[PDB]
Amino acid sequence: DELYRQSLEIISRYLREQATGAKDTKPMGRSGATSRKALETLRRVGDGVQRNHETAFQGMLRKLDIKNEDDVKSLSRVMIHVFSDGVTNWGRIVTLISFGAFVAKHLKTINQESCIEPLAESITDVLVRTKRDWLVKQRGWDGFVEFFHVE
Numbered sequence: 001d002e003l004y005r006q007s008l009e010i011i012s013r014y015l016r017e018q019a020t021g022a023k024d025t026k027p028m029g030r031s032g033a034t035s036r037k038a039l040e041t042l043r044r045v046g047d048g049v050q051r052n053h054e055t056a057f058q059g060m061l062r063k064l065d066i067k068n069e070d071d072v073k074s075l076s077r078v079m080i081h082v083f084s085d086g087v088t089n090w091g092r093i094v095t096l097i098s099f100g101a102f103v104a105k106h107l108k109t110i111n112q113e114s115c116i117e118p119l120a121e122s123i124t125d126v127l128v129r130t131k132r133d134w135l136v137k138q139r140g141w142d143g144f145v146e147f148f149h150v151e
């Protein structure tokens with residue numbers, strides 16, 4: 001499943017970057033040109049989203065009470081409930097990933113950086129299992145890049 005693979009590369013990289021503050025110099029895998037542009041887009045847009053929703057993001061994180069690996073393992077069901085139904089658009093997908101970044105920075109703050117990859121995996125799984133058809137119709141990460149493109 002290539003969509004999964006590409007989504008996970010992008011989301012994992014953005015969350016790690018956000019948590020550690022360091023950009024990764026390594027190239028991407030296949031569809032790497034699009035993935036690189038999608039990561040650059042996430043930088044701009046997702047930092048904006050995290051700033052705009054800081055209060056709701058805080059309250060959610062607080063009620064989630066994330067302290068270790070099993071706490072992280074239990075977040076998929078909340079993620080699905082909040083993300084599954086209703087309107088789908090690129091903004092909501094960016095909100096999913098942006099809150100992922102917010103949680104990743106928390107996880108680094110509490111010395112639980114080892115949970116960031118499973119978090120990424122959980123996010124990607126929920127993204128692809130719930131929005132597959134939609135993402136394919138919108139041309140995947142290419143469509144994401146073009147949607148948020150600023151010349």
Ligand SMILES: Cc1cc(OCCCc2c3n(c4c(-c5c(C)nn(C)c5C)c(Cl)ccc24)[C@H](C)CN(c2cn(C)c4ccc(C(=O)O)cc24)C3=O)cc(C)c1Cl
Pocket residue numbers: 053056057058060075078079082083085086087088089091092095096097099100103123
């Ligand atoms: C890693 C990870 C990712 C997650 O992410 C789940 C989906 C993304 C998401 C949405 N939310 C969110 C709020 C949030 C905000 C902001 N306020 N409150 C009161 C809350 C709870 C917050 Cl704090 C954090 C994420 C939100 C609101 C309800 C709007 N939401 C939408 C639902 N429906 C039908 C939509 C139709 C269009 C659009 C749009 O953007 O035009 C958005 C939505 C969303 O999916 C969840 C969890 C547990 C985790 Cl661990």
